[PDB]
């Protein structure tokens, strides 16, 4: 259970499409989160009395840029937290969150970037998904494009979301073609390509770095949803995904007993384990989130209502749901984030408003 202890609004008055607490922080450091909207990324510290202290912002040199998403990692070189951001321009900016300057940036996607994710074990491995139908894997330590996932059996419309599994051995992606696609990155080929991206030094060579063109996923399905799939998340070997049909579905490839790592690309069966129902969330690009321990699940709707499910139950159908509402919160909640200690939940909205809920 939660209480709303504060709200504010950013002065660009554009949608805030993203929010991420920094889980890559240190001992006792203030709780910091980033918001992305318009052409800016903004950093806030959380304090008691529900105080939300604005720290710094980065505004893009290009007034036409519109950032959609961000993700935290560690800078392997300096050991400080880094923040990657991307949006409609299809350019990944790597931001020093301390100084809010762009250190470097990556171009290549033929269009808007819809989602960024860092590998759960290796801080240098950045995943991006794009309006151009492709996913790309980057090594941000050596600035290399490791692989492009797309083409023959790739997505056939915009890729909207993706997620590494817990170990960082595989990725599930989803998009406007209604499909969810599995891509193993622990194959001998991909492990080797990652090894090569680390061994690449452009000062000591004239060879360019060659990307892998992964045209075929290791599993694909369109039998979970009947519309844009705009958020996917691993729950162990299970998947949580949502379309714009008012439910998050909990499912797995193959039969109940089939191990995810035995699944073949020809596999045509799926097993649905649970469904989380809610209302008035039919627009696309509405993302759900989970706390650090994955004990809970949060999703906001298009009228400013915040759902939180208790996932701490034997079977998915059993989960109870809390709804958080405030008479002043009436705009689409695009995304939520939990602080690392699960004590704070933040929601950001289409009217540039930010909402703090304390556990």
């Amino acid at each position: 259970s939660f209480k709303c202890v504060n709200s504010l609004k950013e002065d660009h008055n554009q949608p805030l499409f993203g929010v991420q607490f920094n889980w890559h922080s240190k001992e006792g450091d203030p709780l910091v989160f980033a918001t992305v909207g318009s052409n800016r990324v903004t950093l806030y510290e959380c304090h008691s009395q529900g105080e939300i202290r604005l720290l710094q912002s980065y505004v893009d040199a290009d007034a036409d840029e519109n950032f959609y998403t961000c993700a935290w990692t560690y800078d392997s070189n300096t050991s400080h937290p880094l923040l990657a951001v991307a949006g409609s321009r299809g350019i990944i900016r790597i931001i020093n969150p301390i100084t809010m300057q762009c250190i470097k940036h990556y171009v290549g996607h033929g269009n808007a970037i819809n989602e960024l994710k860092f590998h759960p074990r290796d801080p240098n491995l950045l995943l991006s998904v794009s309006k151009d139908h492709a996913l790309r894997l980057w090594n941000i330590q050596t600035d290399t494009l490791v692989a492009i996932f797309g083409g023959v059996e790739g997505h056939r419309d915009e890729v909207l979301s993706a997620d590494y599994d817990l170990l960082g051995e595989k990725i599930m992606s989803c998009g406007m073609d209604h499909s969810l696609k599995l891509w193993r990155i622990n194959s001998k080929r991909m492990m080797n390509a990652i090894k090569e991206s680390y061994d690449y030094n452009p000062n000591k060579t004239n060879r360019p770095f060659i990307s892998q063109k992964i045209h075929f996923p290791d599993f694909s399905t369109r039998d979970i949803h009947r519309n844009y799939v705009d958020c996917v998340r691993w729950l162990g070997d299970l998947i949580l995904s949502k379309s714009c049909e008012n439910a998050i579905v909990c499912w797995k490839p193959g039969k109940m007993e089939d191990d995810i790592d035995k699944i073949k690309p020809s596999e045509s069966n799926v097993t649905i384990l649970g469904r989380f129902d809610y209302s008035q969330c039919d627009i696309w690009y509405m993302r759900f989130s989970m706390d650090f321990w994955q004990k809970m699940l949060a999703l906001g709707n298009q009228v400013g209502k915040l759902y939180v499910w208790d996932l701490e139950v034997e079977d998915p159908h059993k989960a109870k749901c809390t709804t958080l509402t405030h008479h002043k919160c009436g705009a689409a909640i695009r995304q939520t984030s939990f602080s690392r200690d699960s004590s704070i939940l933040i929601a950001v909205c289409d009217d540039a408003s930010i909402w703090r809920w304390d556990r």
Partner: peptide
């Protein structure tokens, strides 16, 4: 074929 916004 599918809207991203519910507001003006």
């Amino acid at each position: 074929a599918q809207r991203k916004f519910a507001q003006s």
